[model samples]
Target: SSAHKCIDTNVPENAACYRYLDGTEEWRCLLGFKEVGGKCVPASITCEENNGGCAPEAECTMDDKKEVECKCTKEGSEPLFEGVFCSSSSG
Candidate 1:
């Protein structure tokens, strides 16, 4: 799914790492995320329709204690960028 990403939280839970967002409080995927090479991006990107962001069930963690990127990802095996039909978010 190059058009989009899928953070599979229900991916058997064989997780290599786990983290929570600050203040907002959420979980997120680890791949591509700024982890060892200062690339991990915090799940903070906003949605286009709902001012709600990436739904309620999804979770994310900041790169730093309080990430500056303001980016976010889906927990488990979900995509960092959200959407209903590929890289676009309709939240």
Candidate 2:
């Protein structure tokens, strides 16, 4: 029997080695994390911090990937705001 190690001690924190069908291996960050300059970091900011930079008329929420997403409320407001921050009003 033979055994092979996919990850090395030098691998970045929160990262794992992935083997592909072609016998190629690469270091990838775990879920909710991303690779940046050979280091594993949080994928995005959460809604708890500064309302995720959302406007007053928008609602902050976390998406499937744990990223902050701002959505405008639907309360029959006359002027509806749109955009990532919900700052643009649609007249």
Candidate 3:
């Protein structure tokens, strides 16, 4: 199946890349992995519209209700991160 093929082929055994290009003929890495030369590695972040992504110092935790919770290393930084992402502005 294409699903298993993409997951097995594009995504490395060490999980260095986030499997993407679902339902398509191509396979690619996630947003953050693209920065590290298409390798997942570590200390990366992924922020997309409506998904409520975050920075490297933070993590996007999913809830039972499918809500994205941004866990920041610093206090009150979650909102700042969210606002920046939600407004489609980030450096």
Candidate 4:
């Protein structure tokens, strides 16, 4: 469905409106996410939640290495940003 803005405000939490060509638009799931039924789901699932499986504040995302990974939302979270997945009890 078309929304009021080029970036659909209702996009799934794991997805966003990718704009190109002077507001040209397409919906794209975030890193480590894939679309299903108009919703974005984690591409790499390792948690019971079937989401990204990150910790309370962690986010599952891909890295430059194209490897699935998890990182904290905050610098002070148990795991710092860009921290490796399952590396420590942190994230």
- Clash statistics: count for each candidate: 20, 0, 1, 0
Superior candidate under lDDT, 2 versus 4: 2
How do the residues 6-86 of candidate 3 rate in per-residue lDDT, one tens digit apiece? 444455322322223353323333323333465544334434542333444555666696555655545433333242221
Whole-model Cα lDDT of every candidate shown, in order: 0.31, 0.51, 0.39, 0.50
- Give the Å error, residue 17, model 1: 28
Best by lDDT: 2
TM-score of 2: 0.36
Off by over 4 Å in 1: 2-52, 68-77, 80-91
| Shift of residue 70 alpha carbon in model 4, Å | 16
Choose 1 or 3, whichever is better by TM-score.
3
Q: Pick the candidate with the highest TM-score.
A: 4
- Cand. 1 Cα-lDDT: 0.31
lDDT of 4 by residue, 1-91 (tens): 2332355346566655533435555555554566788887767554344335443456666569766576665644454223322122334
lDDT of 1 by residue, 1-91 (tens): 3222224333222112222322222233333222223334434333332222333344433455553222324333443334111122335
Instruction: Please list the residue runs of candidate 3 whose C-alpha ends up more than 4 Å from where it truly belongs after superposition.
Output: 1-52, 75-78, 81-91
As for candidate 2, its clashing pairs are: none
Query: What's the TM-score of every candidate structure?
Result: 0.20, 0.36, 0.28, 0.37
Look at candidate 1 and tell me the lDDT of residue 34.
26
TM-score of 4: 0.37
Better of 1 and 3 by lDDT: 3
